[PDB]
Amino acid sequence: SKVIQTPRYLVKGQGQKAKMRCIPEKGHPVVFWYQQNKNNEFKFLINFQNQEVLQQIDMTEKRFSAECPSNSPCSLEIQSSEAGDSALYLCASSLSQDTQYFGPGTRLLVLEDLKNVFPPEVAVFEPSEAEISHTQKATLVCLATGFYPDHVELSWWVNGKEVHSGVCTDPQPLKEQPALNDSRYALSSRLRVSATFWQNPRNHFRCQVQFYGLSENDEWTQDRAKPVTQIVSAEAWGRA
């Protein structure tokens, strides 16, 4: 039931190889791969029992190689990556028992090239005094700006622990330059706390953005820093 899939996001340029892994909980020998697109259509890709394929998409539509070796994670791989490959690749497994359990998937994006890939810049904005005296509350705002593609995960950390209560993050990044299909993105998130909590200077707040970019394998031949997968953070301390 606790299926693992890696990486959570993948960006590739056309004509590059795209590899993703799945690892079913042990006890589950049946592994399915599905493709979900942005219109929420699912397409069955292939099915494994043990190391043997049970069913598969139409052969003339098959764009990937896939395998489930013994004592190894199931892998699925596209050799000549193309735009139309961009999607959420889902892995599921079952045990007789017909239930299928899904992993968190791999979000694959295919671009002409990796030249416009940029990591986020991150900033934290401190609550206004006006909000405090008007509501006895204090909203912090995190901005992640200038990243591409929109492959990020934002989290908030209070005194070293991840928090979920009082947090709200945009579902959709916005385009810094909507005219360009190539535009960089921005994303905002709020964390709201009581006034007294914010006013305690012993309290520490961090907004953390995990960015998914290039890996060691990608070739970077450019003047600027290779935009590798990385974490960018911004922080603030409470204030009386």
Add this chain to the structure above:
Amino acid sequence: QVEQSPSALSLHEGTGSALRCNFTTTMRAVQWFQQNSRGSLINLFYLASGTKENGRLKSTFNSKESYSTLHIRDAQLEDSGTYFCAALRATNNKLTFGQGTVLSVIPDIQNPDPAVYQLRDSKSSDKSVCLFTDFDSQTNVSQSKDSDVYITDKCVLDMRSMDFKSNSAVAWSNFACANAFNNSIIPEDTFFPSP
């Protein structure tokens, strides 16, 4: 294949409704999922017949009659997401997915206090954003019409310990908070702190 309905759905917090999936060929079993924002498909139910319960969710499946329902009652924010039914053919281990129901729960704002605040960068004082917050769910935030102005959609956060919910939207540029949200229709009584 499958016919799921509705396609989209807005429930006020605390209200309920039913999703339905008709099957146009005979199925032997159905699964229901909720896909959250993270893209995680969360298993709600598996049924080969009859009816099951699972908290505030109820599900029924009838193979002869060829449909399945999923009932949500007492809707919570956490229920938001996209629901899918998926079925196994009776005569193929692959699931066939319905088109999906996108579910939006409308938070109940108990004591609206609409306001627009200005917040400064922790690192740099000159940088700032505008926060429109505490309006009731009736309000809508319109995107900016200027290309140098950025305005997010509204977002509801839930401070659980205090049992307090609040909507907000963020705007920034490279200007004045007093007119950041002007292309939106905001409450008459909206507080604009006098900085």
